[PDB]
């Protein structure tokens, strides 16, 4: 699966308002939060990484749902960078998948930080208004799309943290299949908490 066998397991939890932010090493396709987030492609065709794993786990109905959403909600266009759509999770233990498109590193350097942050803000706004109680995010735009992990992780955490300071959402997880990524997130979060 996404988490290499024998990876170090680890968790960190912190409350913000009556919200909770959790960082964990894990396989996001096995998360039991109400929502998980897919780091998708504009095409909403499944690829590799988290996107591939989510489609494999969710089953074939996901691709079909996504392409009709593209046809109906998006009028046949790709999902724009930073925007979101929601579908069923199908065979996933999570009820819903929010699909978002992260910026591809340095394609639009002037905009990309705001666009990556939009992924987070739009997903949380959706959770808020639909009262979905819990959501798991993966690392978005990172990889060999990739976005340097320290920079991506700063944008994610700061955006999530401010949103949780200002809103009732519930439980937000960042679920990472890499203990390397987790360690960066853990230390950065502790650093950001200290500032609040």
Author numbering: -10 to 185
The article reads:
To gain insight into the structural and catalytic role of residues N30 and D40, the corresponding alanine mutants were constructed, instead of more conservative mutants, with the aim of completely abolishing the catalytic activity. Surprisingly, these mutants were active towards OAADPr. The 72% reduction in catalytic efficiency found in N30A mutant was not due to overall changes in the structure, whether crystallized or in solution, since its Tm was close to that of WT in 50 mM sodium phosphate pH 7.0. The main difference found was the threefold increase in the Km value, with practically no effect on its kcat. This decrease in N30A affinity was also detected in the thermal shift assay, where slightly lower ΔTm values were observed in the presence of OAADPr at all the concentrations used compared with those obtained with WT. In addition, two different conformations (open and closed) are evident in the β6–α4 loop (residues 131–135). Interestingly, both alternative conformations of the β6–α4 loop are visible in the same subunit of the N30A mutant, representing a snapshot of the complete conformational cycle of this loop. The best WT and G37V crystals were grown in 0.2 M ammonium sulphate, 0.1 M MES pH 6.5 and 30% (w/v) PEGMME 5 K. D40A and N30A mutant crystals were grown in 0.2 M magnesium formate with 20% (w/v) PEG3350 or 20% (w/v) PEG1500 with 20% glycerol, respectively. G37V and N30A mutants showed cubic (I23) and orthorhombic (P212121) space groups, respectively, with 1 subunit per a.u. In the case of N30A mutant, 11 well-ordered residues belonging to the His6-tag were included in the final model.
Macrodomains are ubiquitous and evolutionarily conserved modules (approx. 130–190 residues) that recognize ADPr derivatives in their free form or linked to proteins, including ADPr, PAR, ADP-ribose-1″phosphate and O-acetyl-ADPr (OAADPr). To expand our knowledge concerning the field of macrodomains, we have characterized Oceanobacillus iheyensis macrodomain (OiMacroD), the first to be described from the order Bacillales. A yield of 40 mg of pure protein per litre of culture after a simple two-step purification process was obtained. Its phylogenetic analysis revealed that, among the six different classes previously described for macrodomains, OiMacroD is included in the MacroD-type clade, together with other previously characterized MacroD-like macrodomains, such as hMacroD1 and hMacroD2. The subunit has a mixed α/β fold, similar to that of other nucleotide-binding proteins, composed of a central seven-stranded mixed β-sheet (β1–β2–β7–β6–β3–β5–β4) and five α-helices.
